[PDB]
Amino acid sequence: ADHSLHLSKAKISKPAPYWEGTAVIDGEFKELKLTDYRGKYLVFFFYPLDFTFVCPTEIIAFGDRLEEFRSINTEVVACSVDSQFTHLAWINTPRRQGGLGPIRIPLLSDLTHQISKDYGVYLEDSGHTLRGLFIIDDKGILRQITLNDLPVGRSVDETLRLVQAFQYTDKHGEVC
Amino acid sequence: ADHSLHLSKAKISKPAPYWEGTAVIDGEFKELKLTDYRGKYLVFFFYPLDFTFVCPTEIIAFGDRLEEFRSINTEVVACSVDSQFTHLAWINTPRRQGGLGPIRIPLLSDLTHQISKDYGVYLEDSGHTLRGLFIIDDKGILRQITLNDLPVGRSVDETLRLVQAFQYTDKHGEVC
Amino acid sequence: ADHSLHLSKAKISKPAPYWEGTAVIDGEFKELKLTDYRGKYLVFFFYPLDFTFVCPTEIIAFGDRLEEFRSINTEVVACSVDSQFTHLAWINTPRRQGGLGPIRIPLLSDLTHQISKDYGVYLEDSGHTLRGLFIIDDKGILRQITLNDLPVGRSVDETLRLVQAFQYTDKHGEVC
Amino acid sequence: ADHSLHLSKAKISKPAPYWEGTAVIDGEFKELKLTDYRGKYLVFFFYPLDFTFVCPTEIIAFGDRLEEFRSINTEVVACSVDSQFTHLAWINTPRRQGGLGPIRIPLLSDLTHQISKDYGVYLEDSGHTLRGLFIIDDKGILRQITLNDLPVGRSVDETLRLVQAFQYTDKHGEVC
Amino acid sequence: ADHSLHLSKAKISKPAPYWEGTAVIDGEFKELKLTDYRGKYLVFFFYPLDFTFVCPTEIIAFGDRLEEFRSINTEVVACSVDSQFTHLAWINTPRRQGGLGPIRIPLLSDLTHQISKDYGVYLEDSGHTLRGLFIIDDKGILRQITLNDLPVGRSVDETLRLVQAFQYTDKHGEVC
Amino acid sequence: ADHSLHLSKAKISKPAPYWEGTAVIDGEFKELKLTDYRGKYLVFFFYPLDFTFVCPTEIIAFGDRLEEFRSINTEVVACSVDSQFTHLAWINTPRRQGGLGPIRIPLLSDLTHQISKDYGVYLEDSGHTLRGLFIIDDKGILRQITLNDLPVGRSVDETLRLVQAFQYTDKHGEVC
Amino acid sequence: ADHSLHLSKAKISKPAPYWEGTAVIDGEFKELKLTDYRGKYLVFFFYPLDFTFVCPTEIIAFGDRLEEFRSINTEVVACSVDSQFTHLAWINTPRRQGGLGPIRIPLLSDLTHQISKDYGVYLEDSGHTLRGLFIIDDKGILRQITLNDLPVGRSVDETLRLVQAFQYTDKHGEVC
Amino acid sequence: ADHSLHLSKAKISKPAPYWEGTAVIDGEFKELKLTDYRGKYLVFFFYPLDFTFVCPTEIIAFGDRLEEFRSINTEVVACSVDSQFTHLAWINTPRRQGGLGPIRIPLLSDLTHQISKDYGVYLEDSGHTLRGLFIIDDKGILRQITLNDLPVGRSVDETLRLVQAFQYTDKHGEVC
Amino acid sequence: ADHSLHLSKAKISKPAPYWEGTAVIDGEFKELKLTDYRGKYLVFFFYPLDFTFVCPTEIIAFGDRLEEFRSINTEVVACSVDSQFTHLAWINTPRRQGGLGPIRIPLLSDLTHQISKDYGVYLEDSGHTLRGLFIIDDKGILRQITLNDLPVGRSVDETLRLVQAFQYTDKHGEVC
Amino acid sequence: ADHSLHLSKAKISKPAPYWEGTAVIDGEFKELKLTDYRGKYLVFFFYPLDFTFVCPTEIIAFGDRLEEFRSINTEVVACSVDSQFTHLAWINTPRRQGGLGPIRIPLLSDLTHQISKDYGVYLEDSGHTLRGLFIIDDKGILRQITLNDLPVGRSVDETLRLVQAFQYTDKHGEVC
């Protein structure tokens, strides 16, 4: 139990840790699980907080390119330690007044801080997580781990490339 | 160190647990300590969440009756496990749309869950706290502990009479 | 076994600790148990001592207004660390001489200090308990915990309000 | 850490356990200590409860014959787990009504149960003590231990005989 | 194993510790158990040593008054840490030459020190026991514990009255 | 020491683990340390093995774009569990015969497996590491962690973008 | 503490365990120590009991030949677990009645069983020791250990031979 | 786990530790076990590294004289902590440029460092092994352990002589 | 495991420790056990070393008087920490040249030091045993233990006397 | 303390374990230490037993070729678990009768079995050691370990070659 060492259950080429929670999807609360994405690829990413003073360009970019992700049989889910009521309020607030507006990416609530601890992204002194990202294949196996310091974000193009690459490895062998 | 027994540091006739955090006070972020209230009485209470579908009649009632509490040398502080950004958004939201509206009672953030564990109010399976209330005298001594189940709230009149009674006991002897 | 942290078995939204003992009811010794109140609400409260120099206004007020509590399907029981013989002598002594006088509220003896430790009210250095109050619903679930400092007592009106509120929550949903 | 094995600090020919408390002496509350009896002999005895249905013949007999004990440089103290208020009420109640009446033997209160555990007389299941008696010489050394069942009491003549014998041993050598 | 605390097995109102040994009875060696006295009362007492320069007035007095004890359905047994050969020699020695002389009270040998440790009378530094006495009812329940410092002995009259009182309590209720 | 959990010393926003070793630089053995890059940015990455049947496009791409990394004050270092003699032979082998050819990127040796364990990349079952990449700032603070499953490699463009982003955050504040 | 293995402090060519006690010498009680024999040889032997039905031929033989032991600068001491009062009575009884009669060998009392445990001769189930013998030189060094079953005793001639042999070894070298 | 003491599983006249791995045999990768050599003698030896600047005299000498070992029903296997790809490249490189060239002795890979630890040859600070040699009989029993320091190597003639001696001992008794 | 206290398994009136080994009997190696002497008496003794510069008068004396020991149904065995080859060479060497010469007493070997440790005679600092002797009855029960300091040996006459005494005790009762 | 693993203190390129003892040198008893060979090379070897039926070919061969070893600044010492008296008798016995005869190689005694345990050669079940050999350089650093099974011995030519090789490595660098 040395700080954040033993807490993390995330290992590559191993079954990704199981999570369940309440997500705001299409403006309604829903129950979501990891195994709901079996037989399909999943991009699962963590961002620090809602209602901050910085534009959520990552979520907006991922949502605007969502049909490009499911054109290769992949879903995308975002997570935060906020509650589903805060997520709904963040969506329901107009983007001009510092909000999300309509979004097509499910917003998962980690109010118990447990999903964050399983994936090793929770910051004890901060009370929230860092900016992180995970790729999970059809069989629920962790294939990629990316972890950034807080200011910096993640690129949609890189995630597309990585998912296509992992799928190509799944289908064929090795490329020269 | 199981459940809420060993975690709770709150005891009556003992120095109340020390807390510090960031609060939305009069619309701006501020840094607040417990010792900022030394020499005065303090009503420190918890509520489950922001942006819920239930009217926050407790906070509104306490804030509307603030001159009665200040006239007897007492301040009032509310706490929740939400971030200061969520508190600010909840205040800035119109009350007709479900928001708090303007308030004169500081909203303290307990994003790290530590304040909740100190006072024995955090619910592990829920991710938030129950509805609890504490009275702290001029010297920072816990005088009263009140814990309700989640649905039911607290009455401003009872808090007024309790604080007046504690002050009267401080000034003089027992009454016949 | 850190002082009084681990001794208390009282948790909210959990089954209230089981207690049994000998009570002075209607001037006679009787055997009383917690489960004797199943199917009804129960106001279970503690007070420091018998035969003291202060007036027992709490017990007298609760007993004098017992039909209001019984009209909402609720019983009331008082507890102390005194023996049943002391309770009987306190009742049998005229109230003008400093006694209790006739009472309609059962007086429960906690001579072994076990009930006090279960509910986390026993004061080790004093040899008696503080002023505590507990509400238990039809199913034996703790709904409310109130702990005052020794000088200050409890209000019958607040207890009535809280019992009515919990019952209303039991019957209907949430009120706006 | 058995029920009454490790708790008892009472050993013969060893210094008697130190005790302090509040006693009803001549109708007034007083502070009493073991070392207040240094340089004199002390008969320290326990009895189960106040305000019981049985006659306190032991206390009455010891008090009525107090000049015999004082004529051989010896005091007598009685102890119980009742509070000093119960002792005062028991004395103030007329003996015809079942009370103690006026008494010349101090009544020591053990509400914290500590004195009872030091002398190994506290009964855990009952919440009070058995009938025990201890003799302590001028130097605070335990000379005699006597433990009876709850029904059976002690004799004043035997106590006087034992005190005279111990004093004679203190002065001279051995008698043939 | 703190000194002589955990060693003692003797408790009031609990089954008395079981003992067995070799006794000099009527001038012959015999095997004796505790259960040989079931259905009768038993006075079991200890004395320091044989062949000392002090007259054994206790043993002589108890033996001379044996018909008084037998007339109330009671036996008496004496014990010491000496061997049965020493007891036999002490009896066979003329009383004028410092011996015991003929006796009607069995002398039990505790050469292994185990009986002494069971009843909490053995003195580690002395190598023998103190002067102790125990009363055991028909069912083998310890009713009275008396422990004297080494110089002082016991009175036969007190033992008679104690046994009569315990028997009276067995037969009927409390006396007024 | 639960598998690879406690072994890893690599944490974000914390000083990157210290490493030292022998590197093949410009065709010669040299001693290299982490502190040799203090006051400059460093891209530290791992690759599985030398002399394999798969072309090392990652190393070749990083080396060919070295002047573009150096224009933003950044070095690049590669690590493997192979010995410096294996690295030298791999470089000293023509690329047409399945070799590295000349390279401008230092090749570090992790023959003791310590560097891999510190950065949490070593695979116990296979005896080498996965494909990992780390960004370290001027002050030796870990800024970003990337872990790919073995088949899939890393992109020079993404690393350049991330380093530019971290540097921009270092210089200015936050961008809208 | 495995039975009797760890209790014994007796080792050969090592300083013999220290003992002190009360001995009957010339018919008077005396305090005796091991170091009282320094600079002088000592034969220290253990026998089971006093006042038994078997003639003490060992003690009588050793005493009758005491001048043949002190003529080679050697003392003899006997020990038993009996008390000095029993030893005195055993001496003060004529041999025709089963006694020692006058004796010139000191009789040491081991009432605390500690000397026996140090020399590893105490029998737990018996309550006394076996028949044993030890030789100690001028410097307090154990030179010989002899241990017999209870029924069999020791020979004075063998002890004389052994003491002469050890003294001759002290004076000169090995003999051919 | 005292450094390198408990790791070693090799013991004379005991079943040799079991090993399995990948070897370069006749220019192809193969799977090899220890039990593949049952019914034959086996010379299992370690050497530090591949591609070093020193000449591999041991391997070349053993391979060039392999028919002598095979004529006495003996196999030879070499091991190192390098990967099978490094072994294949070392063989494929011409001997003029510092390679093995063609070899008839299998090259076993110990990339996991486990075989080295089982046979007690791994050097923790170096990252490789020392030069050690082991003889294993038909039944898989270790007959000899030889451990040279790093510079010094092993002789083919001595190994042949030792294998012949062990076989002769197997066939018949001791020779005069 | 305190030095040599815990090692010894030899206790009186208890079954003697089991031993097995290789003995030189009548000039030939034989396998010998303790149970080979069941149903008859055994004298088992130790001596320091073979081939020393001191004449082995003990062994010679025991062997020369062997028919006198056999006439009372008793065997004699000697033990040492030397190997059977050393024993055979010692016997096979002429007595004039510092040897044993022919002997009729079996010479047992304790090369593993186990027999010596079981009987508590082994000396850790010197690597051999002291001079000890043991008597074992028909039932394999240790009857007498003799331990001499190294210079001094044992007497055949005393052993004969002791064996005759033990046998007489076995047959009859006690002698006067 | 797992069998023979923790006992061994011998490791390559480390200071060889320190030993001291008694040796038979030129027919005389001498005291020998390991540090007596500082500044010279040392061949320290073990052999099973003395006086065995097998010819001591190893010792005789090493002794007859001692001038070759001394011409390269090297000493030779043999060790066994036998006593120095056995070594002296083995030398003094004529070689025709199964002895060493005159020898120029010191014979060291390991009667305490400690030297054997330090070098990991002692065999617990047999009570002696196997055939092992050790090379120790000028600075007392263990430089080779060789462990043959008991039937098979060591060759003088190989030891000479190894010592020459180690000395040549000491003088200059590696040879091609």
Contacts of C90 in chain D (CB under 8 A): 89
- Beta carbon pairs, A and B, within 8 Å: 61
Could you give the CA distance from residue C62 to residue C43 in angstroms, rounded to a whole number? 10
Could you give the CA distance from residue J155 to residue J157 in angstroms, rounded to a whole number? 6
I144 touches chain G (CB under 8 A): yes
Closest to J146 (Cβ–Cβ): which among H8, H146, H150? Answer: H146
- Is A12 close to F169, i.e. CB distance below 8 A? no
Q: Is residue I6 part of a domain?
A: no
Could you give the CA distance from residue B65 to residue G2 in angstroms, rounded to a whole number? 78
Q: Is residue B138 part of a domain?
A: yes
- Is E113 close to G125, i.e. CB distance below 8 A? no
For residue A29, the surrounding DSSP H or E stretch is strand A28-33
Closest to E151 (Cβ–Cβ): which among D54, D55, D174? Answer: D174
Among I18, I26, I33, I55, the one annotated catalytic: I55
DSSP-derived secondary structure for A82-137? S-HHHHHHHHHS-GGGTS--S-SS-EEE-TTSHHHHHTT-B-TTTSSB--EEEEE-
CA distance E94 to chain D (A): 17
Q: Is residue A15 part of a domain?
A: no
Among A55, A72, A147, A150, the one annotated catalytic: A55
Helix (H, G, I), strand (E, B) or coil at J24: strand
Residue numbers followed by a gap, chain H, C–N over 2.5 Å: none
Q: How many CA atoms lie within 13 A of G26 on its CB side?
A: 2
Chains touching chain B at 3 or more Cβ pairs under 8 angstroms? Answer: A, C
Contacts of G155 in chain I (CB under 8 A): 158, 161
Please return the burial class of E57, using the count of CB atoms within 10 Å of its CB with bins 0-12, 13-18 and 19+.
Answer: exposed
Chains touching chain D at 3 or more Cβ pairs under 8 angstroms? Answer: C, E
A86 touches chain B (CB under 8 A): yes
Closest to C128 (Cβ–Cβ): which among D110, D111, D128? Answer: D111
- Is E152 close to D144, i.e. CB distance below 8 A? yes
CA distance H165 to chain F (A): 38
Q: What is the dihedral of CA G31, G32, G38, G44, to 10 degrees?
A: 170
Minimal-distance CA residue of chain C relative to B136: C149
Residue D123's CATH number? 3.40.30.10
Could you give the CA distance from residue I78 to residue I146 in angstroms, rounded to a whole number? 14
Task: Decide if G84 contacts G24 (C-beta within 8 A).
Answer: yes
Alpha helices in H37-152 (DSSP H): 57-64, 66-70, 84-92, 114-118
Chains G and D share 3 or more Cβ pairs within 8 Å: no
Task: Decide if J131 contacts J11 (C-beta within 8 A).
Answer: no
Query: Partners of A136 in the beta sheet?
Result: A42, A142
Could you give the CA distance from residue B41 to residue B16 in angstroms, rounded to a whole number? 12
Contacts of J83 in chain I (CB under 8 A): 49-51, 82, 127-128
Is E176 known to be catalytic?
no
Could you give the CA distance from residue I18 to residue I39 in angstroms, rounded to a whole number? 15
Task: Decide if I156 contacts I76 (C-beta within 8 A).
Answer: no
Task: Decide if C41 contacts C135 (C-beta within 8 A).
Answer: yes
Question: Chain E 123-142, CB below 8 Å of chain G: which residues?
Answer: 124-128
For residue B140, the surrounding DSSP H or E stretch is none
B18 touches chain A (CB under 8 A): no
- Identify the sign of the CA torsion G16, G18, G23, G25: positive
Q: Long-range contact list for D98-102, CB < 8 A, 24+ apart?
A: D98/D51, D98/D53, D99/D51, D100/D50, D100/D56, D100/D59, D100/D60, D101/D60
Q: At what angle do helices J84-92 and I84-91 cross, to 10 degrees?
A: 50
- Is I89 close to J85, i.e. CB distance below 8 A? no
- Is C4 close to B13, i.e. CB distance below 8 A? no
CA distance J104 to chain H (A): 22
Q: What is the domain range of residue E88?
A: 20-171
Q: Is residue F67 part of a domain?
A: yes
Closest to E51 (Cβ–Cβ): which among G89, G98, G113? Answer: G89
- Is D86 close to C86, i.e. CB distance below 8 A? yes
Catalytic residue list of F? 55
Contacts of D27 in chain C (CB under 8 A): none
Place of tokens 């170096």: H126
> Could you tell me the CA-to-CA distances from H88 to B45, E111, F82, H108 in Å, in that order?
73, 85, 14, 11
I95 touches chain J (CB under 8 A): no
Q: Which amino acid is at I7?
A: L
Could you give the CA distance from residue E6 to residue H60 in angstroms, rounded to a whole number? 78
Q: At what angle do helices F84-91 and H84-92 cross, to 10 degrees?
A: 50
Task: Decide if J19 contacts J34 (C-beta within 8 A).
Answer: yes
Domain count, chain H: 1
- Is E125 close to G111, i.e. CB distance below 8 A? no
G52 touches chain I (CB under 8 A): no
Q: Which of D51, D55, D124 to mutate to test the interface with C (most CBs of C within 10 A)?
A: D51
Q: Is residue F51 part of a domain?
A: yes
Closest to D82 (Cβ–Cβ): which among C52, C86, C126? Answer: C86
**What are the tokens at D6?**
């490790």
Q: At what angle do helices A84-92 and B84-92 cross, to 10 degrees?
A: 50
Sequence-separated (6 or more) residues with CB below 8 Å from residue A26: none
Helix (H, G, I), strand (E, B) or coil at C6: coil
Experimental method: cryo-EM
Q: Which of I12, I55, I171 to mutate to test the interface with G (most CBs of G within 10 A)?
A: I12
Could you give the CA distance from residue C87 to residue C21 in angstroms, rounded to a whole number? 13
Contacts of G54 in chain I (CB under 8 A): 174, 176
Q: Which amino acid is at B54?
A: V
Sequence-separated (6 or more) residues with CB below 8 Å from residue F142: F10, F11, F12, F13, F14, F15, F16, F134, F135, F136
Contacts of F8 in chain A (CB under 8 A): 5
- What is the number of other CB atoms lying within 10 angstroms of the CB of residue E156? 18
Chains D and E share 3 or more Cβ pairs within 8 Å: yes
Closest to H86 (Cβ–Cβ): which among F51, F125, F126? Answer: F51
Q: Which amino acid is at E4?
A: S
Could you give the CA distance from residue H135 to residue H12 in angstroms, rounded to a whole number? 10
Could you give the CA distance from residue I121 to residue I17 in angstroms, rounded to a whole number? 13
Q: Is residue I13 part of a domain?
A: no
Closest to E51 (Cβ–Cβ): which among G86, G125, G128? Answer: G86
Sequence-separated (6 or more) residues with CB below 8 Å from residue D171: none
Chains touching chain H at 3 or more Cβ pairs under 8 angstroms? Answer: F, J
- Identify the sign of the CA torsion A65, A66, A71, A74: positive
Q: Is residue E80 part of a domain?
A: yes
> Could you tell me the CA-to-CA distances from E22 to B47, E41, E86, G52 in Å, in that order?
77, 20, 12, 15
- Is C54 close to B166, i.e. CB distance below 8 A? no
Q: Which residues of J17-35 are buried (b: 16+ CB within 10 A; e: fewer)?
A: bebebbbbbeeeeeebebe
Could you give the CA distance from residue I117 to residue I124 in angstroms, rounded to a whole number? 10
Please return the burial class of D2, using the count of CB atoms within 10 Å of its CB with bins 0-12, 13-18 and 19+.
Answer: exposed
- Is I146 close to G143, i.e. CB distance below 8 A? no
Q: Is residue C144 part of a domain?
A: yes
Specify the resolution in Å: 2.8
